[PDB]
DNA sequence: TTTTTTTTTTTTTCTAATGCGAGCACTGCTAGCAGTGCTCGCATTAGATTT
């Protein structure tokens, strides 16, 4: 760190990490910090062997970065490459060929140096970039004339008579090839006869290849960039050639027309424009140029049938016992369920790449976790300072001052929420639930039932889906005894509070939920817990306990719907998710209605009893 | 003679910005850091502010801070600049010499409670909104009072920030550093 | 999303064994499967096993032929390339798929692993960058398209009919950056003092005018442009319309604020025979009327003759090859026996591989036989080779044992050979005219060859073409030529594991039989060519395999091996290669 | 410093690189006694010892003359407790310190916490449950017909019914499982109106399945009403799945916050329970839960560091507490012997040891030899020598010309199987045939090992016509394979065998389910597999073969031990064969596996 | 040197501007009161380029 003149931190370095791992091996993380390093719990077992291997790597990586720093005379550089290769590498049947090439090339360089009598110390960055050039310099021409059709670049002084010569990539400026003279060269100033210059070499090759082809010459170039449909051009040589052809010949169709007109006519007859896509049916129209690829044929014929609407009704039979966790997991994202729950498809996105820098600020689920721990500490009225030390040692927070600052704005938000939590909290005991709803036995567990009712708190923004969760978990609670309220507190002072309900209405609404559940496993029920929630926010009127009708608001709920579905350029919209991508690529106003109808069905009892 | 081009200059640039924000911020004591935090969280945003100015010809900065001034210097300066008004308002408090007017609403005197309360520590960078009431340009529109009553106007004339200095130092540094690493 | 689907597929084909990571790939819109498909396909085990199977063949195509061949096979079998084009809009999707594949080639070569490619694709799914080649290709050039383009990217271009829907819009610059009117120098004011803000916002407006100009000069026949009573300030009903801050508005109002009515009038004022204004009335009838297309019958031609027959230039190495079936041919012996019984300057310890052997050979390539060995010369060979000094005193002795060993019955010492009688590393090309069939040969071999009794008949596919090889050494003694070939190998042994018997054993194990016979054919034809009045029996001395490690000062026989082609086998063999 | 010293023991391979690196980081710059001491702690903890009693490290001084290392400065630091306990890398348990020094035993913080949890759970936490002795005795009387002699099993049931936490030790085929069924029956029929939640856990999904089928068939035998047959547990699961161990993390959905909701828990094959999983289990239990462990005292110990069931059963040797013997004498309606003296009442009472094996007796050479394993070698060479018992044979392997002959007998070991394949039979009887004979080798690799023996045996199949092999396919018909890791999809578990064969539908692998059904899986479908001609002794635990053949390598390696050989011996149902040197084996039996833990000290104090 | 397990979810912007609502001082009109002029504060809504 200090070598690069960045202030010594003491965190986020392979020393910090390793020490964190080993210390994670000796002592459980829950014990606490030690030197202000938090033991990293994950490797506690025999697995931890790997760590020792890892730490043996880095030591070497450390040692050598010191050994390579100082300049050296060459014969001091001779022994190095061997120590390094055999140091870091274990040769094998494949590799030994390679490693021998490394030593051979390296020591070839240095030997070139010594034999020239060069005394001064040398920086490594001189040789490292010589050897890079030396290792790729080699070419393999072995199979040239083996007999398989020959692909190869145009090489000076290689001209082999052939029956068929093909030329690709004649686009202007790509060929001929350009390497300017050095510019302080004296030869390029006053040329004599026998001078060789790369451009004249290419220009002469293109003549050789012409003289060499004994039957069919084939010349190709990219007319139009496939990507933008820009224009491209033929090399000047091809241009001269097509010019000469067109000026020396005429098609038999018009034997009296004109010089230039017969010219552009011929030049049109010789030039073929192949299409942009292989499945373009023009290729397959019977004629002279016709494609032998039969794999694209049915595509060009346009003989395929379109993809049916993904949703098809599927039979399902509700068991007698539904574990409450199954219902909970269902209603969280009712669409996602039918993919994972029912038919078992789940799309696992690739894991996130390791970030490149120590955390400057905390965002996303990173800071969310911290709010979770922090809050669960404040509600217990345990000291936040201890936990602070835990994170700091964990290297999790921004360094130093900003750790303190960020920490003490968060403590100031989660303190605000924390009190409001502490106000109503009466410690309570978990309860197990068994019920008969529509001849279906629900079993489950509810943690921490206080005499007053359900209390739940999450450091989140107020959103409906949370609401549905507390709604289910509430109705099951009313459904078995449990007179009392249910409350949920969230950030920016959000709240969901559901008054108590009699066993009758409890079992009736719970019925509606379950019926939703067997509805789900059959067809991918479309209920969007947020966007639909947004649409139902506008229409419903709590004072009249009736959803509004008038079309003025019905163009409010649409704008507030789409606004919720697709997001801003800031917040990602509910509408963008892999689970909703599989159903429709583009939202039809019809499907919009379909969502509004079902959402109106299940969601309504939420807003109706919320207070 | 052989130049290897690089078309992604945003990654080197961002790299350098994190380098700056490491050496010129990590050393800050709590109280100055508190001021840095407000104007931008971290170099991710700072880069977003100066980014158009890192690229292409360097602009000329109107009335640049002197070359020798640090953050602690500017900060101590502004500390005292507010402090004088703090003592002074604490001294002149407790008197109605003003000509009372309808539109200026009598509860405006409650503002003064705030200010005599607002005068405790220097840790805040933000003066109170109620201060806008004591501007002689503000009040005289609705009674010259005494000088410090006018001094608040001097205090509120130039916005109090560390911003210009940081954008200056960072803009000069990040440019060089990038150029060096590419060299 | 198509890149993502591609990820799900490649990731599945990589490890179809896993139930989940496959089914995921099946559900993709690309595969185009219903919920009923996946549902039933979760039930019947046979179908599921069939899918697993086909993907398992795909992995094979993946490993052998590369990537793009695989995705080709998958597209054909699944019929997706067709079913997308059937689907509406799916044309775009299909272009994306093909494009991505084309990139998986470009990154596919440079990376050797099959797996590190799936490594790579994810990493690009995360960071898309800006870069040119990964930028999207135009969806279709078949149909003329609406070419919807930004102002700046229209500069110097020409657009026969031109639309400026949003032109009214404006952006008030909050940043303060301007130019001094005097010095004409770019000045940034880090302070928000309103003057400089104004001095800049004037600039922002003039620039907006220049945008308007450029935008209007683009059209050839017709340009249409939108106009609205746009309001920036958030108060609803005033009589404030900020359009005078729009580039265009200022040109209609002559830089005068108006009301929306005044806006409408000022539009009406200039409107004669060129400019014509209609009110903006939202309406929807029909998306558009395609009326579709008619094409034809169409078919692909199909080759009749074979693409091409067998003409190959091969060495004897291209003969042993590998055996598919009950018998597989390898240099090493599969059977192994464990040993439970319980000076470093030796030949057996020398390193092994193509690399060590190439060194060993390359010694004798320049090496001088008549002079004894110079240890300095050794050290500087090993040094060049990269071999340490652990070798130089160990080698320089051994070589002398080699050069000093007498050979065959003539008792020739390698040392006795003058550079006039040496020929080092002859490369030859031997044409084989009619296809050379194994069984039509190995019978001729076995017939006259005692050594070909061992092991099955050599098997190589029909071949017609040229044959290559390097004679290690050719030299003449007593007016009589010889053929010399060095071999090294033998990881396991040092001592008499090289005998008259075991040498002949290994010869039959690595099939150096056919090899030496082939060379003898070559050397034969070369002498018949070069030597006026050449005769096989008169001038020719036999064949010598020298196992370098095999040479020991103790036993003259160990390591050297000699046999003579029958002169009756070559007589017919040469004829065979002639026709 | 002594750092570069420690760089040698890696060349000497006396220290793992992990050990050295650990000692470097944690030990810091302190007196080299700290550094070396720590490295040795990490080493012994690596080989599976829980602690490092200072006696050993001060007495050996093998890594350095701990005079000069141990005596540094500041007067006398030579006291190891002094010098070590001085530095901050060691503490008494007060601070959050990497290492703990408590009983003269220096050892890791993690091991000390898990250690203490285990201890306190076996001593104070378990309680005495009280019921009517007359009614209970009657229930047992209807469970167990024969009253005429002392029944160990009846004692075991009585004990486990009295004590909240109880262990039942015994050899393979001593009737453990049946006994457990008897117990559970007494449990359900004991509490009529109370909810009885039974849970069945085993450390390996394979053993879990074995337990499922076992207690299914065993519980079906005894009369129960539909209520009881509802309170019969459904299935058994993995220990992990029970604790709900998340695949990536170390988090547990239960731990101390969530007690897993049970009445009783039965962990079969507790020998494989190691210390970390034992503690992490214990944190999940409620205060009403009754737990029972199953395993042999001498079974091969768990891989990860610790020995639990061993250190526990070691105290069974003393026997029952004086009074508990009288209580049980009232319970079983018999005379229960009483262990003389007082050591620990709570622990001694919790342990029952089943000394009767119904599978084979003393006349069978397997029980006599296995019973002679716990003794010295002069008994084992005797048994292997005299009378031959017809159930046991030893073949000398020294020269490879003997080894070839070993393979020669291995043929006839597989003979019936090989023919049944040549006879071209149906898969079921083939699979059942494959379990009569098995090769067991300790090491994985080399001349003697699963990895080597698969090669040599198949090569020996190519020498003598038995089963033809195609090199390119890699799946010649008849090759047995086994699964590397558990699978939820195909319902097959790690440690399970299946036979590759072509029924004519195609090349397909055939597995025998615990339900008797045969499932054919495509080769591509299999998750992981290893050629199963030879098993390591470890993986063979819980299995039973009619004829087993043990192979011990010639060298002396820390893997070859007493318990390894023991499990190999008890592995065969009836027939057995051995291949070893009398010196390598005879010395191997003398060396017992010890893993140092304070438990022996903890239960006495 | 030997080896066992298990499956998944979470969050989301900030700044600013107005519109109104509530509370108050004055002042004029018929000492109190109503209105108006006013002013601040709370919630709600809107917008965030160009190779």
Author numbering:
A (entry chain C): 511 to 1121
B (entry chain B): 148 to 289, 304 to 344
C (entry chain B): 591 to 932, 938 to 1174
D (entry chain D): 2 to 606
The article reads:
The RecBCD/AddAB complexes are highly processive helicase/nuclease machines that digest DNA from the broken end until they encounter a crossover hotspot instigator (Chi) sequence. At this point their activities are modulated to produce a 3-tailed duplex onto which RecA is loaded. However, it was shown instead that the nuclease domain is actually a C-terminal domain of the RecB subunit, the activity of which is regulated by RecD. Consequently, RecBCD has evolved regulatory mechanisms that suppress activity unless the enzyme complex is bound to a bona fide DNA substrate (i.e. a broken DNA end).
